[PDB]
Amino acid sequence: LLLCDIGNSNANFLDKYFTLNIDQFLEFKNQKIFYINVNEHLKEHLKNQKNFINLEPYFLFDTIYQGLGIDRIAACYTIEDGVVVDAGSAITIDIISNSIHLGGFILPGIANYKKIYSHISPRLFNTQVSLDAFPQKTMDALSYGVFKGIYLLIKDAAKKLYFTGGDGQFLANYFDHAIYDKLLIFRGMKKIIKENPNL
Amino acid sequence: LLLCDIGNSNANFLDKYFTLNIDQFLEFIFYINVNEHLKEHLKNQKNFINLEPYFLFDTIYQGLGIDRIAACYTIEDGVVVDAGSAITIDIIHLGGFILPGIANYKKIYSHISPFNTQVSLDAFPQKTMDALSYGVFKGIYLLIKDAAQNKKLYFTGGDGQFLANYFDHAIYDKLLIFRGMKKIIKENPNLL
């Protein structure tokens, strides 16, 4: 059972979890691969690979959010009630209540915060910065700005929390009653398959 | 008496307030400067007199920028927010924190994907531009609120009035920085 979650920078596979970059992904050959894809650039390519089978059409998900990404849908999908946070290149926060998508929002990913500080000034992280004291040096002034900004947005939006993505465990640790599941999305994909076994 | 607050995107002048962008300032005076790539050019200019070494300001914060010092210089008690290229939030000095300015939030998103300022903050967005706008505006809002846990609140800077509107009990002063700069010329009559 080979699953593929395709992004703008990475394709994450599950068989056993691995990550390829996009060049690597384009040279991959294999057996059936089930997939979701947000990369607009790879749509023609995927259509030419007959072994590749798009799960997106099977996702029924109650939202009015225009153009919601299939990646966010798939991560919300096994959740009945809760706040879903996928912390990678971007940080998306989605709110589920009663299997209904109430809305959601987007933040830069942590690496990107680091890039924009640099673009602003060479004068402009400590992951172990405290959130309950004002910072006293510039490293901490940045780390606090970023990490506390995300902490408060998520606190306000949240309800149980589910976390996923490369930075998800780190963000989860600021909260009690929160889970981290590296495989949230692949669980949504797993669920689609258990619901349409003719696949 | 001509004053200049030279920042990372803009040069705020007071002769009559008015602002140049950097590329303008270059083709354009007591000053403070946080623009690294402008250090050289300023030493070149003999009409410009740096005011930074005259400030004496107690803080337990190491390497506090001179724009923050200057903004904070005339405030006995409160949170001081300066919203430009970056947004500095300072406490009266018991510390403070920094964010990207609103336009620099734009720039990350615009590069990734080549703002709605009236976005509601009390409901969850349902389209991409609103999703972005709310992450930015509410993130800033929650941080200041949390920091100003009841203290006074002061805002300045090019985007400072916009942000002040989010608040009851808050004051915007476009000139808070030049007010530090004037108080320094005050304390140092010798400068004239």
XYZ file of C-alpha atoms in Angstrom:
391
model
C 0.000 0.000 0.000
C 2.017 2.894 -1.425
C 0.676 6.383 -0.596
C 2.007 9.716 -1.906
C 1.432 13.231 -0.492
C 2.833 15.686 -3.074
C 3.742 19.298 -2.201
C 5.497 22.276 -3.753
C 8.891 21.107 -2.440
C 8.617 17.476 -1.284
C 6.691 14.341 -2.078
C 6.231 12.345 1.086
C 5.624 8.614 0.557
C 4.323 5.852 2.847
C 4.624 2.027 2.236
C 7.616 2.959 5.942
C 7.925 6.743 5.472
C 10.220 8.575 3.074
C 10.681 11.951 1.479
C 11.838 12.830 -2.030
C 12.446 16.302 -3.461
C 10.763 17.271 -6.713
C 13.655 16.368 -9.069
C 13.842 12.991 -7.281
C 10.101 12.659 -7.558
C 10.088 13.262 -11.296
C 12.589 10.342 -11.841
C 10.812 7.871 -9.575
C 9.304 4.800 -11.106
C 7.547 1.908 -9.438
C 2.803 -0.725 -8.507
C -0.251 1.462 -7.831
C 0.469 4.734 -6.114
C -2.427 6.590 -4.436
C -1.843 10.287 -4.213
C -2.911 13.817 -3.335
C -1.139 16.834 -4.905
C -1.056 20.631 -4.339
C 1.682 21.187 -6.850
C 0.064 22.850 -9.873
C 3.196 22.238 -11.829
C 2.972 18.453 -11.580
C -0.569 17.931 -12.766
C 0.363 16.966 -16.410
C 3.118 14.700 -15.216
C 0.826 12.854 -12.829
C -1.776 12.328 -15.572
C 0.874 10.666 -17.727
C 1.730 8.150 -14.938
C -1.010 5.512 -15.197
C 0.089 3.829 -11.986
C -0.735 7.076 -10.167
C -4.252 7.337 -8.723
C -5.672 10.625 -7.427
C -7.513 10.408 -4.144
C -8.671 14.028 -4.179
C -12.089 13.310 -5.853
C -13.005 10.872 -3.038
C -12.643 13.404 -0.218
C -16.046 14.603 1.003
C -15.463 17.354 3.496
C -17.919 19.990 4.690
C -16.261 23.461 4.123
C -17.106 26.815 2.362
C -13.454 27.862 2.331
C -12.750 28.625 -1.306
C -10.103 26.411 -2.861
C -9.098 24.704 0.444
C -5.871 22.692 -0.189
C -6.266 18.907 -0.446
C -3.385 18.629 1.988
C -5.344 20.484 4.715
C -8.487 18.507 3.871
C -6.629 15.184 4.250
C -5.133 16.240 7.633
C -8.535 17.325 8.958
C -10.230 14.284 7.600
C -9.847 11.739 10.495
C -10.831 14.472 13.006
C -14.406 15.018 14.258
C -13.696 17.921 16.586
C -10.460 19.773 17.087
C -7.881 22.218 15.847
C -5.527 20.924 13.150
C -2.059 22.541 12.791
C 0.301 21.485 9.995
C 3.624 23.121 10.727
C 5.997 22.906 7.712
C 6.919 25.507 5.076
C 3.719 27.198 5.987
C 1.721 26.838 9.204
C -2.007 26.208 8.542
C -4.504 26.150 11.433
C -7.917 24.601 10.698
C -10.933 24.318 12.972
C -13.192 21.255 13.037
C -16.438 20.967 14.963
C -18.680 18.080 14.437
C -17.010 17.017 11.247
C -17.564 20.592 9.904
C -14.731 22.887 8.774
C -15.354 26.175 10.491
C -12.529 28.085 8.818
C -8.770 28.231 9.111
C -5.720 30.442 8.704
C -2.131 30.635 7.589
C 1.147 31.774 8.991
C 4.635 31.686 7.601
C 6.628 28.554 8.371
C 9.419 29.009 10.921
C 12.300 28.869 8.385
C 10.494 31.610 6.458
C 10.264 33.886 9.537
C 14.092 33.410 9.810
C 14.495 34.429 6.087
C 12.382 37.583 6.346
C 14.218 38.852 9.479
C 17.440 38.535 7.464
C 15.913 40.305 4.481
C 14.890 43.126 6.842
C 18.331 43.541 8.509
C 21.618 41.736 9.270
C 20.963 42.905 12.842
C 18.007 40.515 12.752
C 16.345 31.339 16.923
C 16.476 30.136 20.535
C 13.992 27.200 20.616
C 14.376 27.148 24.399
C 13.334 30.789 24.763
C 10.818 31.310 27.562
C 7.313 32.541 26.688
C 6.434 33.908 30.103
C 9.174 36.593 30.394
C 10.127 39.574 28.130
C 13.322 38.941 26.138
C 16.640 40.673 26.909
C 18.683 40.054 23.756
C 17.889 40.204 19.997
C 18.072 36.408 19.415
C 15.385 36.037 22.059
C 13.423 39.050 20.826
C 13.003 37.216 17.465
C 12.370 33.782 18.937
C 9.723 35.198 21.220
C 8.054 37.211 18.488
C 7.746 34.137 16.303
C 7.049 31.397 18.760
C 4.682 33.305 21.037
C 2.749 34.698 18.103
C 2.041 31.100 16.992
C 1.376 29.972 20.576
C -1.270 32.664 21.130
C -2.971 32.257 17.748
C -3.299 28.573 18.342
C -4.490 29.001 21.966
C -7.150 31.428 20.876
C -8.366 29.199 18.014
C -8.558 26.093 20.221
C -11.123 21.790 21.745
C -8.361 19.169 21.341
C -5.277 20.000 19.230
C -3.742 17.787 16.646
C -0.310 18.658 15.251
C 1.650 17.380 12.246
C 4.509 18.398 9.994
C 8.278 18.925 10.446
C 7.718 21.566 13.154
C 4.594 20.073 14.679
C 6.177 18.248 17.706
C 7.985 21.411 18.742
C 4.729 23.427 18.651
C 2.712 20.629 20.320
C 5.057 20.690 23.397
C 3.729 24.118 24.373
C 0.272 22.599 24.973
C -1.386 20.020 27.126
C -4.248 18.000 25.654
C -2.483 18.067 22.277
C -1.314 15.177 20.124
C 1.439 15.115 17.564
C 0.982 12.714 14.697
C 3.562 12.865 11.908
C 1.163 10.889 9.777
C -2.075 12.891 10.011
C -2.419 13.319 6.259
C -1.637 9.682 5.411
C -4.348 8.723 7.932
C -6.880 10.846 5.962
C -5.650 9.077 2.811
C -5.860 5.691 4.613
C -9.466 6.540 5.554
C -10.368 7.342 1.960
C -9.222 3.888 0.892
C -11.073 2.082 3.664
C -14.208 3.933 2.439
C -13.860 3.067 -1.243
C -12.315 -0.445 -1.181
C -12.989 -0.818 -4.967
C -9.794 1.282 -5.123
C 16.327 72.094 13.282
C 16.308 69.101 10.851
C 15.896 65.528 12.339
C 16.196 62.188 10.570
C 15.066 58.742 11.720
C 16.622 56.489 9.119
C 15.105 53.010 9.062
C 15.385 49.824 7.062
C 12.801 50.788 4.423
C 12.234 54.528 5.072
C 13.818 57.829 6.163
C 11.379 59.781 8.382
C 12.310 63.522 8.403
C 11.158 66.373 10.627
C 12.025 69.992 9.606
C 7.073 69.450 8.753
C 7.032 65.609 8.916
C 7.808 63.722 5.734
C 9.337 60.397 4.689
C 11.580 59.207 1.865
C 12.157 55.607 0.881
C 15.837 54.579 0.994
C 16.411 54.751 -2.793
C 15.036 58.341 -2.575
C 17.043 59.230 0.559
C 20.172 58.264 -1.350
C 19.489 61.031 -3.957
C 18.208 63.553 -1.320
C 20.721 67.093 10.190
C 20.702 65.240 13.474
C 20.035 61.531 12.940
C 19.566 58.026 14.305
C 20.090 55.096 11.957
C 19.376 51.378 12.080
C 20.149 50.775 8.359
C 23.386 48.672 8.208
C 23.932 49.243 4.507
C 23.692 52.969 5.168
C 26.461 53.237 7.836
C 29.226 54.158 5.300
C 27.264 56.776 3.368
C 26.267 58.606 6.539
C 29.824 58.987 7.817
C 30.611 60.477 4.395
C 28.017 63.256 5.017
C 29.297 66.049 7.164
C 25.996 67.899 7.701
C 24.669 64.716 9.381
C 25.378 64.422 13.102
C 24.813 61.047 14.755
C 22.790 61.277 17.988
C 23.068 57.662 19.094
C 26.080 58.038 21.486
C 24.260 60.776 23.442
C 21.407 58.546 24.566
C 21.883 57.052 27.966
C 19.077 54.709 28.706
C 18.837 52.044 31.360
C 17.843 48.672 30.146
C 18.617 45.107 31.078
C 18.553 44.384 27.322
C 21.833 43.951 25.471
C 22.240 45.644 22.075
C 18.889 47.478 22.018
C 18.472 49.300 18.711
C 18.531 53.088 18.688
C 15.082 53.378 17.121
C 13.682 51.458 20.070
C 15.680 53.518 22.575
C 14.540 56.802 20.927
C 10.899 55.770 20.721
C 10.956 54.632 24.338
C 13.040 57.618 25.570
C 10.162 59.922 26.681
C 7.851 57.213 28.130
C 7.799 56.719 31.868
C 5.449 53.740 31.883
C 3.807 51.622 29.123
C 4.134 49.342 26.091
C 5.796 51.064 23.097
C 5.035 49.622 19.638
C 6.847 50.922 16.507
C 5.412 49.493 13.292
C 7.519 49.788 10.132
C 9.881 47.308 8.338
C 9.771 45.511 11.623
C 7.443 45.904 14.540
C 9.206 46.428 17.855
C 7.252 45.989 21.068
C 8.957 47.477 24.183
C 8.186 47.513 27.912
C 8.567 50.409 30.420
C 13.069 49.138 29.901
C 12.139 45.611 31.042
C 12.538 44.073 27.590
C 10.756 43.645 24.301
C 10.359 41.645 21.140
C 10.377 42.022 17.370
C 8.209 41.026 14.431
C 8.362 41.540 10.672
C 6.549 44.607 9.404
C 3.280 44.043 7.595
C 4.758 44.604 4.112
C 7.469 42.042 4.898
C 4.765 39.514 5.756
C 3.405 40.326 2.296
C 6.796 39.698 0.671
C 7.151 36.123 2.051
C 3.729 35.238 0.765
C 4.085 36.976 -2.610
C 7.398 35.138 -3.255
C 5.899 31.754 -2.323
C 2.701 32.419 -4.284
C 3.202 34.803 -7.166
C -3.933 42.231 2.467
C -7.560 42.521 3.467
C -7.278 45.076 6.277
C -10.993 44.929 7.103
C -10.798 41.169 7.678
C -12.817 40.164 10.679
C -10.718 39.030 13.628
C -13.598 37.332 15.478
C -14.424 34.721 12.865
C -12.318 32.048 11.134
C -11.393 32.974 7.556
C -12.779 31.156 4.542
C -10.565 32.280 1.690
C -6.798 32.459 1.185
C -6.382 36.294 1.366
C -8.405 36.434 4.553
C -6.512 33.399 5.932
C -3.266 35.332 5.364
C -4.572 38.696 6.600
C -5.903 37.236 9.805
C -2.637 35.302 10.632
C -0.782 38.639 10.342
C -3.247 41.067 11.993
C -4.514 38.781 14.772
C -0.982 37.500 15.533
C 0.229 40.990 16.134
C -2.983 41.872 18.024
C -2.692 38.928 20.386
C 1.014 39.675 21.117
C 0.594 43.315 21.997
C -2.597 42.581 24.020
C -0.713 39.911 25.988
C 2.237 42.204 26.571
C 0.067 45.142 27.515
C -1.765 43.058 30.114
C -3.133 46.045 31.662
C -0.487 48.674 31.061
C -0.753 51.837 28.990
C -0.211 51.369 25.172
C 1.673 53.611 22.701
C 2.057 53.072 18.937
C 4.125 54.991 16.370
C 5.469 54.167 12.940
C 4.122 54.091 9.444
C 1.629 51.288 10.150
C 1.121 52.295 13.762
C -2.263 54.038 13.531
C -3.860 51.065 11.738
C -2.735 48.842 14.604
C -3.892 51.309 17.285
C -7.460 51.116 15.949
C -7.552 47.530 17.222
C -7.344 48.876 20.713
C -9.320 50.770 23.261
C -7.195 52.808 25.717
C -4.342 53.163 23.117
C -2.515 56.239 21.758
C -0.852 56.788 18.408
C 1.857 59.473 18.165
C 3.447 59.782 14.778
C 6.408 61.657 16.287
C 7.367 59.633 19.350
C 10.889 59.119 17.959
C 11.734 62.767 17.189
C 10.458 63.416 20.711
C 13.355 61.230 22.041
C 15.727 62.956 19.570
C 14.611 66.483 20.732
C 14.921 65.510 24.405
C 18.539 64.540 23.680
C 19.392 67.871 22.012
C 17.696 69.257 25.093
C 19.939 67.325 27.532
C 22.991 68.289 25.427
C 22.724 71.992 24.594
C 26.256 71.749 23.103
C 24.911 70.024 19.933
C 23.834 73.411 18.420
